[PDB]
Symmetry: D2
Subunit: 292 residues, 4 copies
C-alpha cells in the first residue's frame, strides 16, 4: 500500500540505544488497530542516519516479523553512494517488504543528471517498487520535477515522498508523470494541503502518536471531504509543528514514551535528550490533539 496515512515509524531503543522489540511490537499493534496504511521502517524518523546497515536490516526484518502480514512494510534504502544504495537494496530482495523509500544522496550534492543516474541504477537492480524521497533541508540537493518526470518512466519507480513543503511541486510533478505515480507528502504541516492539490497520502511523523486521526484525515481527503479533514488537521497542527521543536525524532520519541507506547525515549548521538522546555511544548501539543 502507497496511499493514505503511512507512518515513518520510530526505531524504539532501550537505554543502551539498541532496538527494543517489545516497544516495536506495541507500536506495530497500535498501527494495525488504528488503520495506518503502511509502515516506513528506518526512514529519517527511524534514525536511518545512526544505525549501521546490519542494525538497519535487523530493524526492517523485525518489523516484518512483528507485522506478521497485517500491515505492509516499506524499507528505507537510501544512500549517498549509488553502489551502497544498490547493496542495501539487495539485502531486502525477497524479504517481504512491499517497496523501498530511497532518499536523494545527501552531502555530495549531485547534479540532476547524477540523481537520474543514481535512481535509475538502483531501480535497475531490483524488482521492488521505489519511492523517491526529496528533502533538501537535510541533503543539500533538490530533486526537481523535470527529473522526477524522467525517473517516473522507469517501470519500478512508482512515486515520491516530497518533503520540501513547497506545495507548487504537487502539480508540477503530476503533469509530468502518469496517473498511477504516487505523490506522498513528507511534511506533516502541509500534508493536507498537499493532498487537496492532488497528493495521494502522507508519509507521516505525526502518525506515530495520532494514528487514527491521521488515517481518518487522509481518507476524508481522498474522498474530497477537505473541510471535514481540515477539522482534524486543525487539532493536529500544533503537533505537526512541535514534533520539530527539537530535531526529529527527539520530540516524537518523547511523545511515544509519554503515551506509553515505548519503554524509553533513548536516541543515538548526535541526537540528544529532549529539553524541559521541549517536553512542555510537546505535552501541550498532545493535549491540543486530545491524546493526553
Amino acid at each position: 500500500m502507497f496511499t493514505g496515512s503511512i507512518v515513518a515509524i520510530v526505531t524504539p531503543m532501550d537505554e543502551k540505544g539498541n532496538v527494543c522489540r517489545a516497544s516495536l511490537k506495541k507500536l506495530i499493534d497500535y498501527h494495525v488497530a488504528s488503520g495506518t496504511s503502511a509502515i516506513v521502517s528506518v526512514g529519517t524518523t527511524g534514525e536511518f542516519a545512526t544505525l549501521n546497515h546490519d542494525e538497519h536490516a535487523d530493524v526492517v526484518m523485525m518489523t516484518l516479523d512483528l507485522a506478521d502480514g497485517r500491515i505492509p512494510v516499506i524499507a528505507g534504502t537510501g544512500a549517498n553512494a549509488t553502489a551502497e544504495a544498490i547493496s542495501l537494496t539487495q539485502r531486502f530482495n525477497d524479504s517481504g517488504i512491499v517497496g523501498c523509500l530511497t532518499v536523494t544522496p545527501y552531502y555530495n550534492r549531485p547534479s540532476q543528471e547524477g540523481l537520474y543516474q543514481h535512481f535509475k541504477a538502483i531501480a535497475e537492480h531490483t524488482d521492488l517498487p521505489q519511492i523517491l524521497y526529496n528533502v533538501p533541508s537535510r541533503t543539500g540537493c533538490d530533486l526537481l520535477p523535470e527529473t522526477v518526470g524522467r525517473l517516473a518512466k522507469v517501470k519500478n519507480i512508482i512515486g515520491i515522498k516530497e518533503a520540501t513543503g513547497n506545495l507548487t511541486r504537487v502539480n508540477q510533478i503530476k503533469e509530468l508523470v502518469s496517473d498511477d505515480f504516487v505523490l506522498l507528502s513528507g511534511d506533516d504541516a502541509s500534508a493536507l494541503d498537499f493532498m487537496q492539490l492532488g497528493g495521494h497520502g502522507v508519509i507521516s511523523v505525526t502518525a506515530n502518536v495520532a494514528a487514527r486521526d491521521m488515517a481518518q484525515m487522509c481518507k476524508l481527503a481522498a474522498e474530497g471531504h477537505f473541510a471535514e479533514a481540515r477539522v482534524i488537521n486543525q487539532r493536529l497542527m500544533p503537533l505537526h509543528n512541535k514534533l520539530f521543536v527539537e530535531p526529529n525524532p527527539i520530540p516524537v520519541k518523547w511523545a511515544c514514551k509519554e503515551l506509553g507506547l515505548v519503554a524509553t525515549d533513548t536516541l543515538r548521538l548526535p541526537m540528544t535528550p529532549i529539553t524541559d522546555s521541549g517536553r512542555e511544548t510537546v505535552r501541550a501539543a498532545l493535549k491540543h490533539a486530545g491524546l493526553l
Copy 2:
C-alpha cells in the same frame, strides 16, 4: 601542521573507480614541490561520501606512505553518527597523520547541544588534534560561533574549517577562542578575504591545480602583503568559481587530468563525468590562471 595553503586532495581513480596509486604519488610529489603546507586526505573533494571506511582508510594510509614525511597529512574523519566518527578516528590513532578534519553531522540536523556532544565525544577518544568543519550547504546544519567557543575549550579541538562563505564568522569565532585556535577558510573564492580578517590559511580545492600560486598567496597574506596576494587571487578567481560549475570534485578532477597530474578523471556515482560545456568553462579558467 595547520596554517598556509592546505590542499583538500582529490582521490584519483582508475577507470573502475578505485584509487590510482601512480596518480596519487604524482599529486603528492607536486604538492611537495609546490610548497603546499599540508594535505587533507579524503575530505569532501576526496570523495569521502562514496568511499567505504575501509577504502577511505586505505587512501589515508597510502597518502601517508607516499608523503614519506615530506608533507603533513590530515585525515577526513567525519560521520553523522557519533559512534561511527569515533570508529573512523580510531583507525588513524598512532598512524602518522597529524590531525583530523571532522565535519558536522550531515542529514540528521542535530541541535547545537548535539554538535557539542558529538565533537566532545570524538575528541575524548583520541589524542589527535581535531579541526571542526562547518559546511551547512552540504549538511543541513550550521555550527555556530558560540558552540565553536564551547568546543575550543576541549584540549585537542584546535581549529575550524569555515566553509560558509560568511566572512563575519572569522571575528565572531576569534573573539570566543584562544589565540592559538586555528581559523581556516573552506571557501576558495573568499579565502583571501578570510585571511585578511584574521584567518590563518585555507583548506583549498583550487590548490589541487594551482598549488604554487596558492601557497605564494597564502605566504603573502600571512606577511600582511594583501595587495600582492590579491593580484594572485584575481588570476585564480575564475578557477575558484568555476571549479564549482558542476559539483565538486567533477571539475577539479577534470582539470587535474587536463594538466597531466592524474591518469583519469573518473569519479563514483552519483558524481557524473563533466559535461562538454563544463570542460570549456574550466579550460578557460585554467587559461586565465596561466596554467594552460
Copy 3:
C-alpha cells in the same frame, strides 16, 4: 466584484511616458468583452511606483470614465506612510471605485503591530472596502496570517491579495477569518493551486493578454472543475513565468504592444525597454498560449 479573474491592468503610455487614453480604452473594452471580473487600476503592474498621486488619480478616474459602469474598478491606494495612504484613499471617496488595493508599507519594514495600526487607520477613514496586499519580495516585510486575522475583524477590510507564492498561506489565513473574507492570489504561476486550496480568485498580470482564458480558468476553479482549469493553466504557464523574465510590467507591456492592444510599450525609468532575448522568450510564451 472581488472574486474570479481580476486584471492588474497596465497603465499604457505614449513615447513620453504619459497615459494613453486611446490604448486604455482599447484594454478596457477588451476586458469587458472577455469576461474579466474587475480591473485593478494603478497596482504594481500599473506602475504605481512611478506615477505621482495626481497622475495616479487621473489614471483611476480615466479608467472609471472609460469603464462607464460596464466593469468594476478597484484603485491601488497603498503607501509606506500611513498618513499618505489615508490622504490618497480620500481622493477616491465617492469616485465610483468599488474598493481599494492597499499594499503593506515598503522599505521601512514595520513590525506586525505597525501593519495592524497602518491598515486599521486606513480602513477607519473610508467607507470603501479594502483589500490588503502582501508582496514581501518587493516590500521587505511580510504580513503574516495572524495579523491578517486581526485585521479581517475591521468591518471594511474584506480580503487579501496574497503574492508570496507560498501556498500554505491560503488555509492559515482561511482558518482565522470569516467565510466572507476574500482570498485572492497575486502570483499567476501559483494561482490555480491557490484557488484549488480555497482561494476565490486572482489579481492577475497574465489576464492583461489572456483575459478570456483566465476568466474561464477561474470560473472552472470556482466550480470545482480543477482538471479542466488545469488544462488552461498548462497553456498559460509559460506566460505566467515569462511575463517576469524581466521586471514587471516590462514584458506584459511589450506583449500588449505585440498583440495590438496598446500603441506603445513605453514605461517610466527605472523600468527600461525589453531586451531582444526577452522579446523572443515572451513571444514564444504568447504562441504557447495560442495568442499569436
Copy 4:
C-alpha cells in the same frame, strides 16, 4: 566629506510627529563635540519613508543651518522613480550639502540596466557627489559590483554605502573601481570587518548614541589598529545588534531620548512606539556600552 564615522541621524520629532528643532540642534552639537565625520540627513534612520519631499527638504536645510559649517551634511535623495529622484536632488543643488546618499529604487525591482540608467540620469542632473546605497532587505533589489563598476565611471558617482552585510562585496567592488571610490559600510554589526577588508568608514545607526566611541573606532581602523578598534567594537556589539530589536529607528530614538539627546521618541506610522521588552533590551545594551 566621506571617510570615518558618518552618522545616519535620526529626525527627532515632537509629540505631533514634526521635526523638533531644539532636539536636532542638541544632536548636531553632540556630533560636532564627538568627532563624527559627517551627518547623513533624512537617510533610512532619518525616516525618509514617512516625510514628504517638502518636510524632507526642511529637515535637510535646518540640519545644514544648525551644522553652521562645523560638520558636513549629506542629504538622502533616493526615490524609486528616476524623475522624482532628479527633482529631490535638484532641491539641494547650491544648498551647501556636500553630497547625496541615493538608494536603489525600492518596490519596483529594476534590472541592473535599470539601476545603471537611474543613477546615471540622477548624476547627470547635478554637480553634487553621489553615494549609491544598496540595501536589498529593504528594497527588493541588489546593486551588484559589476554595476557599481559601471557607475563608478560617471564623474560624480564617488562611493557606496553597502548595507548587505555581505563582506565579500568590499573587494569585489574595490577591484572594479578607482582607488578614490569610497566604500562605506551600511551595517554597523559588520562595519569594523568591512573597514578591515579595505572599506573607508561607516554610515552608522549606532553613532547616533555612541558617537565618540564610533569615531575613535573608525580612526583606529584607518590607522591599522584593528585589535584596539575591536575592543571598542565589542563594547558596542550589543547596541549594533539590539538597535534592530524592533524596526529602525524605533530603538535608536528611544535610546536618544533615554540619554537626554532628544525630547521625545515619537515616530511616524507605520513605525510604532518601542515595546516594554524592547526598552529593557536596548537599556541593557546601552549599559554594556558604558553609556548608561
